[PDB]
Enzyme design. Structure first.
Site, short mmCIF file in Angstrom:
data_model
loop_
_atom_site.label_atom_id
_atom_site.label_comp_id
_atom_site.label_asym_id
_atom_site.label_seq_id
_atom_site.Cartn_x
_atom_site.Cartn_y
_atom_site.Cartn_z
N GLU A 127 0.82 -1.20 0.00
CA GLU A 127 0.00 0.00 0.00
C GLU A 127 0.86 1.26 0.00
O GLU A 127 1.62 1.52 0.94
CB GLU A 127 -0.96 0.03 1.18
CG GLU A 127 -1.90 1.21 1.09
CD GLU A 127 -2.88 1.29 2.24
OE1 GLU A 127 -2.73 0.53 3.23
OE2 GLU A 127 -3.80 2.13 2.15
N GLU B 275 -12.84 2.46 2.86
CA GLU B 275 -12.18 2.64 4.15
C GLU B 275 -12.55 3.99 4.74
O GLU B 275 -12.51 5.01 4.04
CB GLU B 275 -10.65 2.53 3.98
CG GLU B 275 -9.89 2.58 5.29
CD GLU B 275 -8.41 2.31 5.12
OE1 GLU B 275 -7.81 2.94 4.23
OE2 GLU B 275 -7.85 1.49 5.88
MN LIG Z 1 -5.70 2.42 3.11
#
Ligand SMILES: [Mn+2]
Ligand SMILES: [Mn+2]
Ligand SMILES: [Mn+2]
Ligand SMILES: [Mn+2]
Lengths: 291, 294, 294, 291
Positions: D146, D240
Site C-alpha cells: 500500500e 475505508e
Molecule cells: Mn488504506
C-alpha cells in the site's frame, strides 16, 4: 424537497398511454415527482395524468420551451400573443392537476438565434411573463424561468441575468430554474450562481455535461450540491437526460440530440435517482456537522 | 509547440488594417502564432498578411466554419461543390503564406442542425474532405477536423467519432483538432479523448467554458494539459475567446456570442499567454521527473 | 494584497547569508513579500534582515511551528512557558523588522500526536495564545493561527475549529491562517471554509497537494481563489513549497519532506509568482463583471 | 471485482464477537467482501472468521501496518525479524481462511518518521518482503504494497516509487495497492498513477480526503474511477473510513483519527456501497460505448 424525473427519460409521446407509462416508470425508478414536457399543453390529457399520479402517489410539474410561432420575445405582437396563450394553457393544466411548479424557456423561443435580442423584444417578453405570473399566482402556481445556454436562448444565459429580469418584474411567485447542464457552459463556477440566486432559486435540473448518465461527463456535481446544501435549498431536484433511443417529435430536434447515450432507461432512471439521493445524503452529513 | 492566439481576440474585421493589427498584438501579447479566421478566403488580403507576418517574425494558421451554402455534408452536390471550392481557396491562401495548418468545422456547416446526419450527407462530406486533404497534401498543408458540440455540428461531436471518420479516409495529412470548450460539453472527461486520439491529435484550442477569460469558468484544464503531457503533444496550442465587445459579421452570430465577457483584449491576450505557458511549464516538470536521470 | 514566498523555496539555513539570499531571490522572482521561517527566533539575525529588506524594498512576515519542548497545548506549565517565551521572541523579532504578520502552528506542537487533545491541554493553549496576542497587539502585530492536517496537529484541523477557538479568545488581532495543502485533506471543499471564516481569514498559504510545483497536483485552486474573490480577501497570499533539494535542519523532518519535488528553485519561484498572479487576474475580471457599471 | 468494506467501519475489536459483527454488518450494507485489520495476526480467531464468512457468503482480505517493534525497514536485524514473523503469520491466517489478498504498509512501520529512509534499511525491507511474497506464493496468496502518504511512511509515497521497489524484487505475486485518500496528497493526479501501475495494480481503497463519508471531501473520484475503467481493473475495491466514534486501540491513534466524522455506520456503509457501485455502473456505460 421532491426528487423528480423528466418525462423524456421514458417516452417522447404523451398521449394517455405515454402519460401512464411515464408516471409508472418514474415511480418504479424511485422518484417522488414527474416533470411533464408540456410542449403542447392544448392536447395534454389532464384526466389521465391526474389519475396516473393518484394511482402511483406521485407529484407532478411541467416544463416547456417556446418556438418561433410562440416566441414572446418577438417584436410581432401576434406571435407574442400565441405564446402567451400557450403559457396560460400550460398554467391552467397545472392548476387542474393540483400541481404548483411551472418552468422552462418561457421568456423566448428555445432555439439557436442568429441575432442578439432586441430592446422591444425583451420588453414584450417581460410584459408577457409578468401577466402569466399573475395568472399563475391567482391559481397558487409558481413560475420559474430556466436559464439555458447560448444555443437555446439569447435572453437568459446566466443566473445573474435572470435575477435582473426578475428584478424588473417584481412578482412574488416568479423564481429562477437552474440546470447543471447549462451552468456547466455559461457560469463562472457551480457555487456562485446558487449563492447569488439564493432565495429566488425555485427549481433545479440535474443533467450531465452531455445529458447522458450522471457521472459520465464533466459536470462538477460535488460543488453544485454542496452549494445547494449551504443555501438550504428545498425545492424540486429533477433528473433530465436525452438519448436518440427515445425521441420526441420536436424536443429532440430542438435540443440537438444526435447521440445514443443510453438504451436502458430503467437502468438510467434508477441510477439517477440513486445518484441524486446519495449526493443529498452526503450533503446532509456536512450540514449536520455545522451544528 | 507553438502557443497561438485566435484573431477574434483582436478584431472582427480582417481587412488590411485588421490583419496587421492582429499580427502585431498577437506578437506583443507573447504568442508565437496567430490563427486567422478565414470565413471568406476569397477576399482575404494575403500579401498584407505575408508582409505583416514577416515584419513581426510570427507564424500563422487559419481556421473556418462552413455555412449552409457551402455545407459539404449536404446531400445536394452543388452545395458540396461550393463548400469544396471555399476550402480549396482557404488551403491556397495558407500555401501562399507558407503556413502548414488548416483547421475548423470543414466537414459540415457550423450551425445548429434540425435533424441528424444522413448517410448520403456523410458520404459527401467524407469524399470532399478527402479531395481537399489530397490537394492540401501536395501544398505541404495539414488539415485537422475540429470536433465541436451538438449545436455547431451533427457530424463530429466527439474525438472517437472523428477517429472513425479519419480511419475511413486514411490520409497522412488529416488530423483531429480538439477544443477544450467543446470537450467540456460532449466528452466523458478531459483525458480519455487525448489518450484515444494520441498521434492523430494535430491541433488544440484552449477555450474556457463560456469562451471568456481563462480560469473564469468550469473547464478542467488541469486534467487536459496533463493528458497532453502524457502523449507528448507538440502541436499548436491556441487561445480562443469571444466577446460581444469584438464582433465578426457572421462568425460571432454563428457561435451565439451574446455576452460581454471582456472589454480589454490587451489584458485578455496577455493573460491567456501567461495562463497557457504556466500550465505548460507545470507539466514539463512532471515529464522531467519521469526521466530516468531524476 | 501582498503576493509572498516562503523562505524554504530558497534556503534551509537562515544565517546572515541565507537571509540576504532569500530576500534577493524572492524579489527577483516577482514577489512582494518573504515569509521567514522562525523556528528559532532567538538566533535569527534581525539586523541583517532589516538591512536586506530595506535594500530590496521587500515586505516580510514570519511563521513557525512549535515542538515538544515548546508545546503550548501541553498539560505541563513549564513546557507551555517555554513555548510562550519562544512565541514572544518571534513577535519581538517581527516588531524590530516593522512587520505586521505572525502566523503558523503556534497553538500546539507541529507534530504527529499519538493521542487526542485534553481539556487541560486545550485550556493551556488558549490562555497562552491570548497572552501572546495581547503582547503582539501593543507592538502592532497580527497573529493568525494556521489550520493544519491531522498529522501536524490534534487541535485545529479545520477552519470551523479555528473559529470556535477564536470566539473564546475574542482578540481583535487574532485571525485564521488557511493553507490549500491542508484544506485539501481535512475540509469538505475549497469554498465553504473561506465563506465561513470570511473576515477572520487573515493569511493564506498556496501549496500544491504534495507541496511541489503549483499545478502539478490535485488541489482545486479554481474554487479556492473564486471563494477568496467572493469574500473580497485582501490579505497576504504566500507560496509555500518543500523539496529534499533544500533542507531545513528541523522543519523539513517535521513536515515529512522525503521527496525531490524540485531542483531548480529559480524556476519554481518564478512559476509560482506567475501562477498565483494569473489566478488573481482571473478572479479580478469576475469581480469587475459584478460591478453595476458592467 | 469484489466490492469490499474495511472492518473499522464496524468495530475496533476483533475478538470472536467483533469478527461476527463486522462480517454481518458488511453483508447487510451490501458489500461482497470484508477486509480484516490484522494488526495482531497472532490473536486473530481464524475459526470464527471462517465460520462467519461462510454464514454470510462473504469473501475476505486482510491488511495491516507494522510498528516500531516490527519495522522491516529497520537497520536492526532483530526488529526486521519480528516484522517478518508477523507478516508470515498474517499470510498464514489468510491461507487458513482460503483468502487470496494480503495488503498494507508491510515494507516499513506505519508512522510519521523523523528522518529519511536509509540504504541499509531499504535493503532489509526489500529482502524481507521478497521472502514473505515467496511464502505467500506457495500458498496461493497475493501480496500488495500500500502506497501511503509522507506521514505514514518514508518509503513508498507514490505509485512510481512502488513500481521501482517491485522492479527490484521481481516476484509474480507482488502487486501495488492504491488508496484514493493517499493519492489525493502525494500524486500528480488521479489517472496517471493508475495508467502507470496498470497491471501491477492489484488492490484499491476508496477513501475520502478526510476519511469520512464519500463525496464530502476533495477527492476526485470521477477521474479515478474513469481511469480504473480504462485499464480494465478487476481487483478488489474496498471502502475505508475512520471516525472517533469507533476506536481501535492502536490503529486509530496511528492514523490520527481525532474527529467524529460519522456516528451511524449502518448509514455510512450502505451509502459507501451505493456510492462505489453506482460509480462503477457509470463507468461500465462509458466502456460499453467504446465498442
Ligand atoms: Mn488504506
Ligand atoms: Mn433543463
Ligand atoms: Mn474552436
Ligand atoms: Mn503552511
Amino acid at each position: 424537497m421532491k426528487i423528480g424525473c423528466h418525462g423524456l427519460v421514458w417516452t417522447g409521446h404523451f398521449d394517455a398511454e405515454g402519460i401512464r407509462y411515464s408516471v409508472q416508470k418514474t415511480r418504479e425508478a424511485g422518484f417522488d415527482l414527474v416533470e411533464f414536457p408540456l410542449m403542447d399543453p392544448f392536447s395534454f390529457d389532464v384526466q389521465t395524468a391526474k389519475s396516473a399520479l393518484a394511482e402511483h402517489g406521485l407529484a407532478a410539474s411541467a416544463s416547456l420551451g417556446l418556438s418561433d410561432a410562440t416566441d414572446v420575445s418577438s417584436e410581432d405582437p401576434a406571435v407574442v400573443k400565441a405564446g402567451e396563450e400557450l403559457l396560460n394553457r400550460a398554467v391552467d393544466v397545472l392548476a387542474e392537476l393540483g400541481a404548483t411548479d411551472f418552468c422552462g424557456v418561457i421568456y423566448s423561443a428555445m432555439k439557436k438565434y442568429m441575432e442578439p435580442a432586441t430592446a422591444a423584444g425583451l420588453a414584450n417578453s417581460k410584459a408577457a411573463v409578468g401577466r402569466v405570473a399573475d395568472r399563475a399566482s391567482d391559481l397558487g402556481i409558481n413560475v420559474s424561468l430556466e436559464v439555458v445556454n447560448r444555443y437555446e436562448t439569447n435572453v437568459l444565459n446566466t443566473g445573474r441575468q435572470a435575477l435582473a429580469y426578475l428584478e424588473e418584474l417584481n412578482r412574488p411567485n416568479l423564481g429562477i430554474h437552474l440546470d447543471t447542464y447549462h451552468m456547466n457552459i455559461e457560469e463562472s463556477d457551480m457555487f456562485s450562481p446558487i449563492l447569488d440566486t439564493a432565495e429566488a432559486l425555485r427549481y433545479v435540473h440535474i443533467g450531465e455535461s452531455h445529458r447522458g448518465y450522471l457521472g459520465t461527463g464533466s459536470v462538477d456535481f460535488d460543488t453544485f450540491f454542496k452549494a445547494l446544501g449551504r443555501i438550504g435549498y428545498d425545492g424540486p431536484v429533477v433528473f433530465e437526460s436525452f438519448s436518440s433511443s427515445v425521441v420526441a417529435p420536436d424536443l429532440s430536434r430542438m435540443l440537438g440530440i444526435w447521440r445514443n447515450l443510453w438504451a436502458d432507461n430503467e437502468e438510467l432512471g434508477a441510477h439517477a435517482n440513486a445518484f441524486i439521493r446519495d449526493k443529498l445524503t452526503a450533503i446532509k452529513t456536512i450540514e449536520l456537522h455545522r451544528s
